[PDB]
Amino acid sequence: SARIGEVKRETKETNVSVKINLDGHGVSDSSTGIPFLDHMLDQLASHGLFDVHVRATGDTHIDDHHTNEDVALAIGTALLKALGERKGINRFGDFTAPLDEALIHVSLDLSGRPYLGYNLEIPTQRVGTYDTQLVEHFFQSLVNTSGMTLHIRQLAGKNSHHIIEATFKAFARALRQATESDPRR
Amino acid sequence: SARIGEVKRETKETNVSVKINLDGHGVSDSSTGIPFLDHMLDQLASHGLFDVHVRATGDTHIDDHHTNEDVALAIGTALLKALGERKGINRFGDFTAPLDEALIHVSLDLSGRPYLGYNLEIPTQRVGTYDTQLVEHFFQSLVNTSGMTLHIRQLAGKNSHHIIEATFKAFARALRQATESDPRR
Amino acid sequence: SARIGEVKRETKETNVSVKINLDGHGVSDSSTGIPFLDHMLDQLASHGLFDVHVRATGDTHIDDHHTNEDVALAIGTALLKALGERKGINRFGDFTAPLDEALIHVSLDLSGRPYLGYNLEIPTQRVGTYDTQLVEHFFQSLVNTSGMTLHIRQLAGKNSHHIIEATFKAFARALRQATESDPRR
Amino acid sequence: SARIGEVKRETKETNVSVKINLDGHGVSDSSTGIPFLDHMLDQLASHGLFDVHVRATGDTHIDDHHTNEDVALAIGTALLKALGERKGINRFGDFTAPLDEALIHVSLDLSGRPYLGYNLEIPTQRVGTYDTQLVEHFFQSLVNTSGMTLHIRQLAGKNSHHIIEATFKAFARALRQATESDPRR
Amino acid sequence: SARIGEVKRETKETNVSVKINLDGHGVSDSSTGIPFLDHMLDQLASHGLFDVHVRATGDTHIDDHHTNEDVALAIGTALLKALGERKGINRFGDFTAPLDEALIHVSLDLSGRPYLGYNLEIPTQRVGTYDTQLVEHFFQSLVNTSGMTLHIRQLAGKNSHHIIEATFKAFARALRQATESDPRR
Amino acid sequence: SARIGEVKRETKETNVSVKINLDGHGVSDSSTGIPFLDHMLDQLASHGLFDVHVRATGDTHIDDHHTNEDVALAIGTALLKALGERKGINRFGDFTAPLDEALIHVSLDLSGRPYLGYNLEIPTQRVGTYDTQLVEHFFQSLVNTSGMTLHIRQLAGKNSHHIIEATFKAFARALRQATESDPRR
Numbered sequence A, B, C, D, E, F: 001s002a003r004i005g006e007v008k009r010e011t012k013e014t015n016v017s018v019k020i021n022l023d024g025h026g027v028s029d030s031s032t033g034i035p036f037l038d039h040m041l042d043q044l045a046s047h048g049l050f051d052v053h054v055r056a057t058g059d060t061h062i063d064d065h066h067t068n069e070d071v072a073l074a075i076g077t078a079l080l081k082a083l084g085e086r087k088g089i090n091r092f093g094d095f096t097a098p099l100d101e102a103l104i105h106v107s108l109d110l111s112g113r114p115y116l117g118y119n120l121e122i123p124t125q126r127v128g129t130y131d132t133q134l135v136e137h138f139f140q141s142l143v144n145t146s147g148m149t150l151h152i153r154q155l156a157g158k159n160s161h162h163i164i165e166a167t168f169k170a171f172a173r174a175l176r177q178a179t180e181s182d183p184r185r
């Protein structure tokens, strides 16, 4: 039985639906109203082999902040649900991924205590129409509802798209590791 | 046949018995007369899936130094014994583990040449009654008798218990990797 | 069917033949006219479990530069050939290896876009008769023909032989990882 | 009907029971196995007019860390339970309290998003037998389970007992404010 | 006839008895009420080949200061007594001793003029329950009653126990040299 | 009965035979395939009054590293063998030797715990054909198999040959001291 977590959450600002399969095949099905975030969620699915279904609508006329936050909160909860009792898994993940000149190390533990360590220095304010301050907020919010210990470390990088995308690749691979079965447990 | 190493060593200062199973299930059975060290040895077993049996008595009225040292020396020898001819193993291990805000990278090679690289900066002098200078000495002594190449790198951390415990988690996971069978060897 | 790439390339300066098996057993069979480079190619085979066959002759009376370059170019092409359509592989590799006091992190992606990030600081000009500037050039040239994204990071080290050899160990292990089958792909 | 939250939580390390009345009279009834922490919990009751009942036992032979953490986690959950639907309350609290030369500002929001901002610089390692690193950990853990936004700012202070005690006074008064009824809501 | 010095000294704070044989076999028989100091006195006997008998009781409820001081004063006097007319001895001693990473140089002259040069930098405040400020005070007090010129120089060291113990080894060996017969005198 | 240690060790890289007499007359009989190292081994014999017999062959086409290392490892083991139970010896050695402007202090203890402290700054890369990085590696490897505590301190020096040769003189004299009988033991 595949480990699936589903969350529906409505606020005055946003409406969000998430479904995640930890034991997926990389099926990507994300539409948040934020194209860059959709692109990063595709990366999460492809590089983590999660199946990721996300729908969101919200007050993007104001800015992308509330939608970005509420998407991330719901993903964190969906991951927590899917994990269930967490028996027999690796629990820890550790991966360093490049994207051309960018190089990002991610280390995480599915600990039940939220913590984000984050040192990205993204040198431009907008990637497309996406506010690059929202990258940290995405991870922070995801940590807070999932109860994950997460460290994100920028080792190299110049291009903002490369830096952010490499982060999602490394995160996805580390989370795949952590969620997979430990053969000796 | 599980790989088991046993060491009994007596000095004027200490009496030590160690038994380690490299192919264990995380059985933790350590009583050194140093409660913090017992706690760290439990971590080694749990995170490495080693079975760890340690008994020690010694001159803890003077300080914990001699007991800590002689425990570590005997563990190093027990690991060397258990490894035997070292045929078919990964040999190398590499893991970065968090504990909340702390993040520790451990890289090791079961090389037969002792070396410790160590850069922890533990910001308090005592964790409980345990002298935090003894952490480096534990690893140094273990390296010296095991003939291990070991690098311990503090990437982040503020709380002394977190820093030390994360170190043992990362070490345990790296040593598990190094001791496991390489499927292509 | 094992994945084998073969390259023969002649220039006015050099004559080079390379055969690499990605699914090898560590068979080492390298003779380049540069003894230190032969030694490093042996490391690549042993630590990566590649079978590596290299023959080169060239204008070593001038210096080792042209031979080193043309060997590396041909290895890069051989790796590209052997990889074929790249279906079902890990693609990414990440390994940190020590050699005594030296510690080198290698992260790579078989991306099809060449990039070398390289920060080694080798403190002597010659290891034997081998010009230590040629280490960077070897990796650069290999990247350029293979289309690999490669980051090489010196974390520690003092002895030039240790630094360079640790680099080849880490590279070999990372490349083994990247080239191996992903069990979920 | 007074707002009461009760939590019982057992781990391998600790056993904890907490009962908190938000609409109390300052009844103090705390015994954690950590005398300094008991003293601070008395301050919370007296200065906040909470009724605070805490019992804990744990592995204080190792150090006070696990007990301190698990007490704080359970208090955070008890506060969350007691708050219920959070209708009609002030929600925000803001108080700056002195204790002789020490002066501590606390600002909080019962937001449902955990965050701790903390800048105390406690100039000694032990107050009695209490490790002063545990002050931050107490607040962090409490924030994490309560979902509180909490900022703690040291404006002045030299004596470690004064600094920590002033913090608890300011926190208690700010939390009393936040939990009280807003007369216009 | 072996050179033996005996001192009994009582104060309101302490009661001390010392017997030292300059021409001993390393017989160690010290009980001061300060375990670390007992350990160092054992080192003095073992490394100097002095026979050392010490008994002390005192006001260790206040701290170890008075006992440490009065032990050292009495040892200095005992050494002076034992030396007698100082005819035919080397008089000068010079030894540099390691203990792992620690390296301590001691040079002394049995001159009849007290002087202590001391540059140890002991990086922790307590070794066991022993206040590391008391090391300097021990040597100072010993110098003052013995009338010794003594220089203690820290050349290397990180571990406080190693630094202090190496000091006693070097001191013992230098004092053995100084007290021994000069074959040409 | 003179104390003689003999070691034969073969690797894929090197073949080494060592015989050392601790109670020798300075008989020098070393041929390693590294002329500078032979010269230093002659110094060890002459200045230490050891009889030193060394034969080595190896992969000097690559560089002198493996031969230098394997010679030193075997010397360390030979010294350990020769020492036997270590009863009645001085154990410690301490000597500062000049060679013209160069001045090197060596302090050692035949402790059974390996440690090298080394601060030489050799201002040229090659003495003859000998890579001056290999000096540290020689001492490190010797320490590792002998279980010696060794500190090497450069007090003065400009000429690389003088610095290295003075080091071997001081080491030889210190080791002679440590290995000799203590007349009171």
Ligand SMILES: [Mn+2]
Pocket: A065, A069, A137
């Ligand atoms: Mn927000």
Ligand SMILES: [Mn+2]
Pocket: A039, A161, A165
């Ligand atoms: Mn993209």
Ligand SMILES: [Mn+2]
Pocket: B065, B069, B137, E100, E162
């Ligand atoms: Mn020690």
Ligand SMILES: [Mn+2]
Pocket: B039, B161, B165, D066
């Ligand atoms: Mn713990």
Ligand SMILES: [Mn+2]
Pocket: C065, C069, C137
């Ligand atoms: Mn070129």
Ligand SMILES: [Mn+2]
Pocket: C039, C161, C165, F066
């Ligand atoms: Mn080599």
Ligand SMILES: [Mn+2]
Pocket: B100, B162, D065, D069, D137
């Ligand atoms: Mn904790």
Ligand SMILES: [Mn+2]
Pocket: D039, D161, D165
């Ligand atoms: Mn108080």
Ligand SMILES: [Mn+2]
Pocket: E065, E069, E137
């Ligand atoms: Mn005094």
Ligand SMILES: [Mn+2]
Pocket: B066, E039, E161, E165
């Ligand atoms: Mn000791």
Ligand SMILES: [Mn+2]
Pocket: C100, C162, F065, F069, F137
């Ligand atoms: Mn080497």
Ligand SMILES: [Mn+2]
Pocket: F039, F161, F165
């Ligand atoms: Mn010479």
